[PDB]
Every structure is written in C-alpha cells, then in structure tokens.
Amino acid sequence: NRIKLVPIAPSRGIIYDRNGIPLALNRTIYQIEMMPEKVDNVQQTLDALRSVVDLTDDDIAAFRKERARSHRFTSIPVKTNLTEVQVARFAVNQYRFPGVEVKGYKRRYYPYGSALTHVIGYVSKINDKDVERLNNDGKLANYAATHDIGKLGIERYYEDVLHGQTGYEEVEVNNRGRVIRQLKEVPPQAGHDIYLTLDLKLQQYIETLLAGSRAAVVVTDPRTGGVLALVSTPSYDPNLFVDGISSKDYSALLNDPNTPLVNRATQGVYPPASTVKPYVAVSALSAGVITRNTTLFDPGWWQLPGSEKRYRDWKKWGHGRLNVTRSLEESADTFFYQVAYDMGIDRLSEWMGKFGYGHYTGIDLAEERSGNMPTREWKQKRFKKPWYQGDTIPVGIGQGYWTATPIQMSKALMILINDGIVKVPHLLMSTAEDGKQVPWVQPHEPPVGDIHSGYWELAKDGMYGVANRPNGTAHKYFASAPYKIAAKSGTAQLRDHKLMTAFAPYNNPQVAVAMILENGGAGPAVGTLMRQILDHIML
Numbered sequence: 001n002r003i004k005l006v007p008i009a010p011s012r013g014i015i016y017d018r019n020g021i022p023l024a025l026n027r028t029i030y031q032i033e034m035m036p037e038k039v040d041n042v043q044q045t046l047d048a049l050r051s052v053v054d055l056t057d058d059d060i061a062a063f064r065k066e067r068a069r070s071h072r073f074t075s076i077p078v079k080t081n082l083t084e085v086q087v088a089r090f091a092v093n094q095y096r097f098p099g100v101e102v103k104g105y106k107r108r109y110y111p112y113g114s115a116l117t118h119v120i121g122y123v124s125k126i127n128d129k130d131v132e133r134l135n136n137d138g139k140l141a142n143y144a145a146t147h148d149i150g151k152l153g154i155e156r157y158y159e160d161v162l163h164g165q166t167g168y169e170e171v172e173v174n175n176r177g178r179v180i181r182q183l184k185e186v187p188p189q190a191g192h193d194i195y196l197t198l199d200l201k202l203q204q205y206i207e208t209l210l211a212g213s214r215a216a217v218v219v220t221d222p223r224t225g226g227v228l229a230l231v232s233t234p235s236y237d238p239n240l241f242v243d244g245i246s247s248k249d250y251s252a253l254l255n256d257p258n259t260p261l262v263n264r265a266t267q268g269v270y271p272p273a274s275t276v277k278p279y280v281a282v283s284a285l286s287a288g289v290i291t292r293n294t295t296l297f298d299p300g301w302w303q304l305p306g307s308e309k310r311y312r313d314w315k316k317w318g319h320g321r322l323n324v325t326r327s328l329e330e331s332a333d334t335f336f337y338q339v340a341y342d343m344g345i346d347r348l349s350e351w352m353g354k355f356g357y358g359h360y361t362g363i364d365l366a367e368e369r370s371g372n373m374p375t376r377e378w379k380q381k382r383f384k385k386p387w388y389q390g391d392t393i394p395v396g397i398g399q400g401y402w403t404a405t406p407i408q409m410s411k412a413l414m415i416l417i418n419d420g421i422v423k424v425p426h427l428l429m430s431t432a433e434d435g436k437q438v439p440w441v442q443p444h445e446p447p448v449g450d451i452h453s454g455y456w457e458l459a460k461d462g463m464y465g466v467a468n469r470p471n472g473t474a475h476k477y478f479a480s481a482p483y484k485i486a487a488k489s490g491t492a493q494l495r496d497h498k499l500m501t502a503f504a505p506y507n508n509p510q511v512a513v514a515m516i517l518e519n520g521g522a523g524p525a526v527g528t529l530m531r532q533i534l535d536h537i538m539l
C-alpha cells in the first residue's frame with residue numbers, strides 16, 4: 001500500500017482597515033467531486049446521489065461535459081456550493097460512495113464590494129501568466145495546492161504575505177488509489193494578516209460623493225503618508241471575479257466607455273495644471289529666480305523673448321501687479337510663464353522630479369503609471385527633435401508635456417505640507433502572523449530643497465489664500481469652514497478636467513486630498529465635493 005504526499009493549501013490572510021474592520025474575508029465552499037476512474041460504477045453513484053445531495057439532471061449534465069473538458073485522472077466536481085444540510089447528508093452516507101469526496105475550498109469574500117475594488121483588488125483563478133510569473137519569481141513550489149491569486153490592488157501587491165506557507169500530509173492509498181488513512185500531517189501556516197491605513201467609512205462616503213462621475217480621490221494623512229482613502233469611480237463588484245466572472249459580466253466591464261477597470265487614482269494620467277503652481281513656486285524661490293517681493297505687471301498674457309509667441313492668462317485683461325502670493329491666490333498664469341522661462345526646463349524638471357512627478361510614487365499597489373515630467377533628453381528620445389524654449393513655458397502652469405497621476409499629486413502635496421520632507425503614500429500599516437507585528441517602514445527618501453527655509457510657508461500661505469481670502473479662486477468653497485482649509489485647484493485640457501488639492505486644518509494639517517473629476521464630473525463642482533470630504537473628516 002503506497003504512501004502519497006499531498007499538499008495542503010494555506011488559509012489566506014485577512015485584510016483589515018485602520019480600525020480592525022475586515023475588508024477581505026474567507027468563506028468555505030463545499031463540493032463533492034470524483035475521479036471517475038476511481039469510482040467503480042459512475043452511473044449507479046450519480047443516481048444514488050440524487051437522494052443524498054439533491055443531485056439534479058443539470059448537475060449531471062455539467063458533470064459529463066466537465067468530464068470531457070478534462071484530462072485523465074482529473075478530479076471532476078459533481079455538485080458545487082452544497083448547503084450544510086447536503087454536506088451532512090453526504091457525510092453520513094460517505095461509506096456508500098468510495099471514490100466520491102467531499103471537499104472544502106476557502107473562497108474570498110468582499111463585504112463592502114465596489115467601495116474598495118481598486119485599492120483592495122480581488123483574488124481569482126490562477127491562469128497561465130500567473131503560473132509563469134510565479135515560476136520566474138521562483139515561488140511556484142509553494143502553490144502546489146493553491147488555485148487562486150491576487151489579481152490587483154492590495155491582494156496582488158501583498159500576495160506573498162497574504163498567501164502563507166503550503167503544508168502537506170502523508171496518506172495511505174489502496175490498489176484503486178483511494179485514501180484510506182492519513183499517516184502524518186505537517187499543517188500549512190496561514191498567510192499574514194495585514195492592517196491597512198484605510199478608513200472604510202471615509203472610503204464609502206467618498207464613493208457616495210463620486211456617484212456617476214469618472215473621478216479619483218486620494219486622501220492621506222501627511223503626518224504619516226498613510227492612504228486614508230483611495231477611490232476611483234466608476235467601480236465594480238470585486239466578488240464577480242472570485243468564483244469566476246461571467247464573460248457576459250466581464251465583456252460589460254471592458255465595453256463600459258467609462259472604463260471602470262482603470263484605477264484612476266494610480267493609473268489616471270492627466271495634466272496637473274494649476275495644482276502645480278505651489279511646487280513651481282517653492283522651486284523658484286529655492287532656485288533664487290524669484291523672491292517673496294518679486295513683482296511683474298500682467299496685461300493678461302506673456303510674450304516669449306525674441307519671439308511673437310504669446311501665452312495667455314486665464315484673466316483676459318490680467319491680474320495687474322503680481323507677486324508669488326497673489327499669483328497662487330488667483331492662480332495667475334503670467335507669473336508662472338515668466339518663472340518657467342527664467343528657471344529653464346533643466347532646473348524646472350529637476351525640481352518637479354524631486355516632488356515626485358514623472359516617477360512612481362512608491363505606493364504599495366502594482367497598478368501605477370509614472371506620468372511625464374518633460375526633459376530635453378526625453379523630448380529628444382521621444383520625437384528626435386530638440387527642446388525649444390516655448391516648450392518650457394506651458395510647463396510653468398502644469399501643462400504642455402506634463403502629466404501626472406492623482407497619487408503623484410498626493411505625494412507632491414504632502415511634501416509641501418512637510419516642508420520638503422518626502423513621505424511615500426502607502427496603504428500598509430502593519431503585517432501580522434504569527435502574532436509578530438512588522439510596521440511599514442518608510443524607505444530612505446532624501447528631502448526636497450531645504451527644511452529651515454521659509455519658502456514652504458510662502459506657498460502654503462498662498463493656498464490658504466485660495467481658500468480663504470476674497471480674491472482666492474476657491475473662496476466660495478472653503479472660506480466658511482471653522483477649521484482652516486488651504487487648497488489649490490486646476491483645470492486641465494468634451495469638457496475640461498476639474499482638479500482640486502487641499503489640506504486641513506492649515507495650522508496643523510491632519511489630512512491631505514488630491515482629487516479630479518474627469519470632464520467636470522456628473523454633479524457637484526470639485527470644490528463642493530472637496531469641502532464635503534474635508535467636512536466629513538473634520539466634522
């Protein structure tokens with residue numbers, strides 16, 4: 001009688017929000033299955049199982065077809081999703097059905113569904129590119145009994161910790177290959193539980209605010225860089241994929257022109273526009289090409305020296321006399337056109353790159369785009385034409401070749417809040433299992449510019465003005481708040497993309513928000529939605 005070794009799959013770790021609410025759970029699902037070769041009389045067995053587990057003609061139909069579409073000595077399921085009564089009935093009848101097995105499979109469950117789709121992700125059936133990627137990473141050995149895998153979001157980024165360590169059992173089998181006894185069991189070890197920085201009730205609220213629009217919101221705590229909410233709408237139900245998604249259901253997702261499969265927060269690539277003016281400002285003050293007192297007269301436009309090329313301000317007849325404070329307050333373009341010209345693309349890209357633009361943020365998701373912070377070398381490689389000085393000008397106001405993601409906006413915003421300290425936006429607070437907590441540790445990111453310098457306060461004071469002073473572009477959204485709001489909006493490029501960044505309270509910022517409504521959103525203005533979000537958080 002031969003002794004077989006049989007892998008035991010591990011139980012997948014739980015994902016919890018910042019308050020211990022489980023966001024990704026396991027459910028056991030029961031089926032009876034058989035290897036027909038190991039079943040003496042298949043027909044007799046099927047018919048007697050009508051009585052025992054309420055086996056139906058359709059169940060048998062599905063059985064024989066799946067029996068065809070399967071390799072020799074494959075275990076064919078006979079009946080799936082058994083009720084507990086049905087398992088108990090089969091259990092007390094097990095001895096009549098040698099070669100029929102009852103088995104439990106842990107499946108993944110997402111209780112809050114579409115509110116956490118892009119950030120949490122889903123696990124679903126392993127396919128051939130999963131196999132390949134596991135075999136390159138040299139992890140395949142540990143999946144001998146594992147059949148699902150993180151496909152995106154946190155479920156994929158942390159697949160390795162969530163999965164656990166496969167175990168194994170020694171079982172005795174008879175002449176016909178049926179297990180009669182278990183000799184030894186070396187149990188698996190559950191994957192680690194992971195605790196996220198997310199606030200689930202804040203994420204559901206924001207998802208409610210965003211209803212109908214193509215939008216992304218990132219909310220962070222700038223004191224820690226944690227992601228309190230990262231939502232992309234429209235979304236979809238991650239539970240659809242867990243037990244295998246309908247191709248009807250799946251083609252409906254891909255064919256949605258509102259592209260709900262896209263994580264807009266990390267893969268949405270847009271011109272950052274005016275939202276960059278605070279960072280361009282800090283950069284110019286540090287570079288020394290402007291001053292707290294630098295002033296220019298804006299007629300509503302700006303002309304490139306040695307050229308008839310004129311760039312426009314949004315105010316048709318100008319903002320009159322502008323310094324950096326007032327330019328941030330009223331989101332003047334002319335001031336920043338000039339700043340860009342003086343900075344030069346070289347210095348300008350180098351500084352904006354230090355705020356994170358054009359680079360991956362370091363967030364712990366695998367779905368991410370880097371956007372584009374243009375350089376001479378990049379323009380050369382991408383178009384084999386050299387850099388012209390008029391290419392620098394729109395970069396001053398976050399346009400031209402410049403594109404960024406809302407998670408990049410977030411990183412940059414937090415740097416400004418922290419006076420050049422670079423905090424990576426992250427979702428993981430800690431790991432666990434087996435009882436030992438490992439906290440998420442910030443990678444070494446050297447600061448931007450200089451901490452002691454007073455330019456950080458200057459640019460932030462301007463954002464306070466945007467939100468609070470009568471000439472600020474966002475006064476109507478934020479002035480009346482008890483806590484002090486600082487903000488900076490932008491408009492990009494069908495209708496225009498509406499962007500808003502903000503943080504609160506201004507004295508001791510507890511929350512940072514970058515958000516964007518594609519083509520203006522479906523209802524409220526982005527400034528109204530920002531107020532409501534900052535209200536919900538601060539009460």
Ligand SMILES: *C(=O)N1C[C@H](NOS(=O)(=O)O)CC[C@H]1C(N)=O
Pocket residue numbers: 272273274275313314331332333397473488489490491492
């Ligand atoms: C920045 O994107 N801009 C300057 C100004 N911002 O106004 S908004 O934030 O209220 O949309 C006008 C739009 C835009 C520009 N450069 O035109």
